[model samples]
Target chain A: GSGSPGVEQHTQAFLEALEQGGGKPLEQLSPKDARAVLTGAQASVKVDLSGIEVKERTIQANGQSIKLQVVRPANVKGELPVFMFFHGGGWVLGDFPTHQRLIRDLVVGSGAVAVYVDYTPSPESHYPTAINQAYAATQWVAEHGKEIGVDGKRLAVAGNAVGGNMAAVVALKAKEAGTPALRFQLLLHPVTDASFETASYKQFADGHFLTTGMMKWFWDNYTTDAKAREQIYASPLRASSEQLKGLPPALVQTAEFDVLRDEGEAYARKLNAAGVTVTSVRYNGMIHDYGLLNPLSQVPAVKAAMRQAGTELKVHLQLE
Target chain B: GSGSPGVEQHTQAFLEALEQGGGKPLEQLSPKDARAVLTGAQASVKVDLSGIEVKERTIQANGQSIKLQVVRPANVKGELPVFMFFHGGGWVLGDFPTHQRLIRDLVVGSGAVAVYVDYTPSPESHYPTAINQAYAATQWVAEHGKEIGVDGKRLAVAGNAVGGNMAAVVALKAKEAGTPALRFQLLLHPVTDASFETASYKQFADGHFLTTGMMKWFWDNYTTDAKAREQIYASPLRASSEQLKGLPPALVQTAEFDVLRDEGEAYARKLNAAGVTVTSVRYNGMIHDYGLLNPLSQVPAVKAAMRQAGTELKVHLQLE
Candidate 1:
């Protein structure tokens, strides 16, 4: 039911190898079979692809604007549930083009409409503003779906990288507004603090595409104003997700090579413990934002795993 | 001199208490003193005062308007430097009025003007919006200092709670803006994450006015959106201060019973390690926001700790 049950077998094989290797001690196994096993394991089988269509829209709420794109079947009509999306770039650099295709695939695969928003940029635009824009957009979407041929009240938000930040903000904003209720959130490689002084960041700073130095640059440019650094949305990891009851279900994604990997999963653990419905997926060997690129690579394989995610979201939204 | 020539003595008092109380196993001190003396000892002082001029104002910048509060002495000003103030409400609640008196004191004591802003709250105003408002206000003040009777370039942002988060955001914003650079950051009890999975959150959850439950509640109201939970400004403790190098200096104040106390102090240390001008002052027997409530309390003693903070800020702004 949760997409590609066979993939579990593949993951188990790698993990089994890890246990045999004494958990690889200092050295770890990669999720990519090409890198992990000395003898490359060939693909076991080819899977079927389902046809799906995704729709996108750009919205301006309270003056600030973000673009929303979705992937789903063309036949989908009135009251089709929605998921708001934000693509991460550490709050500095990331845009629709990079994440657009991925979202389309999700819409098609999940058979759900995906609304992607290009929230405001940072430094020049810091804390609360982008968050506020997300909230306004989410609220607008939630309240005006009937006008747009979709169910606004059934809207949810999702994203990777800094987009995860917007997804969280949109959900919170929905709650604050008390209209256009949210049903789910998907966060990939989410970040939660301005104090990026973590051992993980230090240990994983280099080699990965998302470097600590680059992250710092993003933070510096994103919220150039130092004082606004501690708000709830700026660093949601610092806020307790315990009260997330009734907000919406969540699907969190993390990459083993990503600096934000641990915190993303940690929040998922917290959400789960808080009695909120949460599913966390840790894609081994993947770096930040890697999923948005090279869809035919590990990305598509992992994305196929989202078939279950889409089913879950659709069922939860009570879509017929 | 660094702060509190009595620093070692203060540390010793804590050690003695841990030794007498039979505390956790510490590797630094002798086993006897480690378990018995330094374990559960906390020292605190409070300060509270009245008679402040606080008014609301909205400033425009970058095609957006921001809401702020101006707090200062009753009269007299030959273009005083501005001290932008934000309050701690976990980024959900609390307001400029809540911190009005404290801003007044900081302004009078530091011979500056206090410009406090009401950053958009989360859930309703998620992610960068609050931070965006902070940066906009900073720019507004920097550009219109003469109209407000202050030196635009000699501006600083300060806060105690979510305000501290904004303070951090403002500092980073100033650095990126490259205009009217931040003079200093005064951070008090600040929130830094959403997971609430830290040992500190567990240890001080109850007893303190800020309970794990209340914190969860605050976070719920502030972030409520699970996706927004991973932003840096939402939780600064999770962000790295390394990027803070280019920002102005800092003066950090922490409380004894505050759940965020440890994280706040940790941020100060992080800033110091990042080679920023940082000064940390912790009250041994206080709780979050206690410093403002009882300014005359031992916590005020920490103000003397900020003497160098003022000097550095003034010198940086080249104020006579």
Candidate 2:
């Protein structure tokens, strides 16, 4: 597992395509365009719309109007479980529309109504702004999901990239609230450590889509202060065992070629050591954002992960 | 509330009576003799145990045999709520038999089956050993209390001084385990901090019965290293909001004339800030072990505190 392995063929092809059309580096592009490039033409990862329902909604949380979408399987009877998805964009860029397919995968696969949502991104919003929003949304969904045909009592938080980071933080916040107890967490290549100093950060510093340089930008943009970046809400990998303890069961997904690879795995290890039930898996040869960067409908790794997510979501949530 | 105030008349009278009989300080006695002095004939603090059934049992926890007592009101039928009590001895003294009357008050007052128990006192068992054993006992009752006719699910941990410290630590540990969902914490003049640096520590540094000098000895006996003493397990008042988060509701009873007073109130404020439901009450003119150092059945403050405790205990444990 320590040996450097070649990227999986399909992932390599996506990387090449990404490189050939590589636009100006993030430093040059305006934030809006920069966001566009990360989520471009991700092959319209589609699922059968006939059996699913997507409701557009806006949640007022932390005094901000955050956008959200609820994806529910239309024919599934009785109140459904909830899976809240927060998309990753280095805590700077991505939004719900960019991660819709990822959201659909969780809902369709796990039989849990999933949320594709956006928290305020950085430079403009800064450190606790997003964490607060995410936690507020968690409270909202837990209290209000019952009215939306879902059992908020049975809940899960999920996301990719920074979204994964949000899920972890949100779960911590929910546990703090001691209400609407969360049942599980699904983290996909999450940015658990804002330090950006892992060996994986060194090994996959570049060539990997999520380079250490880019993560440094994300961390700085999210919160410029080095010490502030070390807070548990921003750097969960740095959180103490005391804080990590009592959290809901988790599914931590990592990529062998992502700069975030080590910290995500480290978080899974910490959670496990803290007596939390967790399932951690690394997609060998997979790069960061493999699920969202490609048409997730076409990625075998994405399919495999969602299949696993489905099983764990059901078991941990105790869904019959 | 910040101004120095006179000790209550009755409490002052007890202090005068205690001063007249003052013997060799703690430093002069062996741990056993030192322990003996703390629980000397306190006017034979007796409670009518006629309506109560007492059973002795030993629990094996963390590879240690810990003593426990089950005090159930004989007239109370149906599965009872449980109150687990650890005795205060600066984490160095106090045993179940010595704290028998205290246990009876909680059982008689709260109508919950109460456990008068011991976690290995310090000098022999270090920092984690007691915390570990107390947590193990929590799990033991949680998993096995049903056989003894207590609803393990509706559980509470109560204590005086270091026993209060252990109860706080145990509640944190139980929350971490995410089981037996604890309902209440009754911390009576608890030793939540080991720093011994509060203003109250200076004011009551001596002649308060529970002096800072004696506390330093108890802490040294428990764990001599200053940094180790600062650890969350050893000094829960120093624990981060993260560790304190999600903890059950608590009733923190602090005495105005105790060296541990400020830290107990500080711990309560911290717990409240961390989103824990805590009711912290400071007695205007009492000393540490004010409920125990005297005959509790005779002390008005003790009686008043138990009455308040009974109301809170029932309300928090959600006893129908």
Candidate 3:
């Protein structure tokens, strides 16, 4: 149903590859194999990182040392706006390399320092750990941003898919705690509800890169139990308007062909209704994680969408 | 809470003028008085319509002669995409001259032919009459577009406030009845839900131009019964996902400080969930009727917002 021929062509090729791989759905794979399968797909893709600097550091959070990557333009002066970035692989996969080019482009495009986290994925760390780690990491940025040349006053949170879910939860938690008042939040096709009953889930349930079955699998692996899934932290869309009120301004981007599109827009509306400034953008002819996938990123629509988001980020962060 | 200082300054001046006029609320005014007040505000303002040609016609629909205006760029050759426009006055207060310049600007900006219908205002025509008139007019355009040098196959429906509600209803009806498959829908801060229970209704219940009380007044004047308010035709937001499944793509613009913002965005989300392509844009610092009001229209944000809407219209209509 995508309007673009190029997007449809790329989607068809991805589907063919998916079908050729014995067609074993993601839910059937063990967590390790699922992560391996995802990583293997990214192994051969190369991205140019000529003008950006990438560095890694370990930060103490929630009784563990979490590895985070800092990506920024090479010639930065004074303090830069900081973005806490979380990569999306349904919370069970994805890492620094998984979204390296994306973070680099974000940093270069927005002229901001992007802090990418390696939050423990699902089934390994389970329900609350990822949430707790994400929160702690955001708090760490607020308390110790100056050490890494980041302005504590100019901080934002960003993510895609489940990582988007984490970013939203982090913003909510930060707002409630009254510290680290963030400037903005960028959520890309975020999973806001675990219920999976929205009309989009039914419409884009299959053939799309992120299937409903895979979503259910991700939910099962991320939460400790069904009740845990119902909590506001896990499903930010389930949060009441009162809970969502007073959060930072947000730029929520959704993919037209992705299942999470409705919830992302719904969350943006929720934030706006609750008096939060939000700009919700939908990419007309793309799917979930298109920005992270190498072949799909070659498409003009995807590139334009990422550029638009970066432009929004620069505007929100007040970068010239 | 709006970010634009120019908007705030203009709002302050308008409020001062309202205070000078004894500060009566819209719901307190007689319908005639409300119409007069709205008209008085527009009489002194002027619009430059130098390059557009305007014509008026009468068509019989629902046993009534409906007066509608057609606007097109002068010397336009070949067939032009047509837009069916309904003006917003809470279904009781607006008319042709109320939005004359706005429609002309749309015609010139999008390079499309615009048909503005003078649907019978409410309390005079009542609930279903206006809706029926809008639907019948749309079908008339589809059936007789060629007579008017308009492309029947390329038509869009647009409105604001109650007009937006009517436009959305027409799109749904057209899709279900399968006569005029609309190319796009342009809903500018539309009144999508008659229930008036949205968080935005509660948040912006007072102090905004279109207050919750005024909305309730409009609902009372339009609907025959309380249950009629629940009908999808009366309140498009109440329509099920099934009803919205195949509606045309849409551009829904909401105001940051308007009571109807939430419902408008909610309808956009519903359309997207039902697999309709929608571009939902929210103006950061404006209120309801900002586009139609003379003073507010002079503000840069309002001009930019209207220009953006015109740009979207051009893009969707595929005009050069």
Candidate 4:
């Protein structure tokens, strides 16, 4: 008789599918094994790439030479708007190939040139390093974006999960520098802060895919120093009110049953307060990582969310 | 170029109308003045109350005499399920007559007996006093509801703003005492926590109706002691994970632009984790205390929200 309807069926199915390919929980696995477990379960669904152009380039920013995978619709003639994407893996998992489907969706759906930033994962590169790489890639797109025919005039940033955390920080960092002004942000079930003391974390400590233990592991691997976790770059949700001001508008998408729901929402609210336009939506009866990232997902909400992102891209990217 | 869409049009109009009444902000005004300012701007719309029967009763449950305004449809004979409603005025403003329209709406829409708790406001009362009295009122209704031709079998608690804070506590306290099992909760843009540091509070520290300063004042007036604010009874959002478990199914409604939004949603997430049925909805482009309480207001979402509450009441109260 409880109205607290549990997770959505499709979301649970996705979790079931994950369990099928799972060896051990991400927390129990060695970092390398954890990385491959996600990789083993990923890119299963084929995307139509007949009309898409893909290429790779290296850029120097923040004293690191990072690779960027650029995906664009070949049919587009002139320079297209840019979208810098960060792949989610709790900062230590996932890579360009692991999240190519989502990247493809952004290119095809929004008619923009999507570039996936290849930042080093944690245990290899720690706190402030990945964000610096991520931010550097965005800067490269702004400064040398012309080298690849991407137009930064209508530029934006996007990411799912920890990538979402990166996108938010990138937006803030861009605003703080007052250059390459981002038009919008697409954050999907993002981890905006690391407090984990949020109501969502306390309530959904386990069972719904993104386990609290797993996040704790990710956080520790990313930064063993406690003070690093409190830094604004490490946790954009910790950004001062002054730092939040004049940032790009955002569409913060969260899952109703996700451990990161509150933090994502809290970040959206923070952005709104900072005079940045924000559109916040919580997907009902869903768990973390259940949206556009799951390419084969047939959940009606997934397509609907993609449509929403496409529309926002059309608006902010000035496609219309 | 900021995408942070400000408040919705009708919502802004409501705030403008309040300014027309020409008074100091609630935080700057004394409790008596604040109460009248709310009263002065209230109940201008005419709801058809012809078919509802109204009664006043005094009950004793916690060594204090409290009054409850019982409103029910005159057409229902024998017995009907009871709904204990706590009117929100930051727990200091509204009363039965002032909120009679909402009470009537419950009667006409849901076809249940609506009992309005007349607990003492803060300053005149204090922390634990209002919640204790509110709990006592619910207890009396469950114990003595039959005296007024009502059934306790489908009992539920509802409130707006701080009254929502009251309703949440009442549910927890009742669950602990193990009697008067509540079937559901309809919380309208509730103040579920006192941690003003929430994202919503920081973003909406000023403007957008429910000012942080006003809430700070209300919290101070209600409890001068810092420890009391941390208690579950005073701030239901602070309810421990264990206390949250097995509580009633809840429809925790919140406003997107309200300072209290995150806390309300956080509480809903917590309840879901506790295995309680929770239907959480956040009204977009809205400020705190903007929905059902404004009787004369004609925002489309208002009616839609009322209908949502009515349907949930019917389902939980088993009138369906």
Instruction: Identify the leading candidate in terms of lDDT.
Output: 3
Residue lDDT tens for model 2, A1-320: 12235887777766677678666667456675666565445422323222345655777766788777777864456788887888888877877645655665667677778876667777778988888878887788888887677888888888888888999998888777776588899898898876756798888877767777788878878887878878888888888889889998898889888888888999999999999999899988788877766443466776787788776777766654
By summed lDDT, the worst window of 10 consecutive residues in model 3 chain B runs over: B1-10
Worst 10 residues of 1 chain A by lDDT: A38-47
Which tens-of-lDDT digit does each residue in A208-229 have in candidate 1? Answer: 5456776776677677665666
Residue runs of model 4 more than 4 Å from their true location after superposition:
A1-320, B1-6, B19-22, B43-48
Worst 10 residues of 3 chain A by lDDT: A1-10
- Extract clashing residue pairs from model 3: none
For candidate 4, write residues B1-320 as lDDT tens digits.
11136677777766676656565778888887787656545523433334465656778787889988888765455789989999888766778756766776677678888998888887898888888888888988888888978897779998888878888888888988897789888898888777789998898886566788888888888888889888888788777778888888899889888889999999999888878889999888777776555543457777777778877887889854
Interface root-mean-square deviation, candidate 1? 33.0
- The sequence of per-residue lDDT tens digits that candidate 2 reaches over residues B208-234 is 677667888888889978788788877
Candidate 4 residue-wise lDDT at B139: 85
User: Candidate 3, overall lDDT?
Assistant: 0.80
Q: Which segments of candidate 3 are over 4 A away from where they belong?
A: A1-7, A20-22, B1-320
lDDT of 4 by residue, A185-225 (tens): 99989988878799999888876778899999989989988
Cα distance off (Å), candidate 4, residue A290 = 65
lDDT of 3 by residue, A1-320 (tens): 32224346666677667666554777898886777566556534444443455556688865788877877666445788888998999988888765766786687678888999888887887888887788888889888888777876788999888889989999988977787778889998899998787887888898778888999988888874878888888888888889988898888899888889899889999899888998888887678887787657667777787887677777778743
Worst 10 residues of 2 chain B by lDDT: B42-51
